Amino acid sequence: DHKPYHKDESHPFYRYDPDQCILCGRCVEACQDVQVTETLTIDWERKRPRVIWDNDVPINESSCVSCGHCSTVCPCNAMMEKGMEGEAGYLTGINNETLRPMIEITKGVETGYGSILAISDMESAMRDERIKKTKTVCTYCGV
């Protein structure tokens, strides 16, 4: 079921997809007790509880330190760094105007998750060809 809230691309570094949010609160636990900035909260009193910023203020206007913990600790694409959007895979480049029907057609036809998930694992495996992950030490502060 689609959540009645909009995606917040206000922040130049990360986005929030409410329709993909699973209210795990990993981001909320990180911002308050790990980063200890206390921007991220979840309004449970609402009909559809969602991850809020301050008093449901857009991320750019909010007290966001922009550390990026929330995106590190999120388990799915709900909290994601904007640098990956339409860049990670091969089929991800497709415009959302054509990719959204592409998804609806897939749901209608599919039988079980087992089969389509296996196909997705193949795109994920093909991703090793183009994406490289290299360990580095930050050239900013002496931390």
């Binding site: 091969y90 480049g93 093909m126 991703r127 090793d128 060809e129």
Partner: protein, 61 residues
Amino acid sequence: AKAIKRIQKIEVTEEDQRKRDLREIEDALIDHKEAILETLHMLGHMNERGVLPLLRGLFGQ
């Protein structure tokens, strides 16, 4: 102007014969220049639309 039958073959060197054989390909390249540029454009479009990287990933992984 006596009667003779011996024949002496000309010295087509290793690189000489090579340059003639290469010119053979270079001629068919010119003869099909039209289709060559057309295919290259099409191929550039396949990379443009991720078709080529999609296949590269497929074989690489």
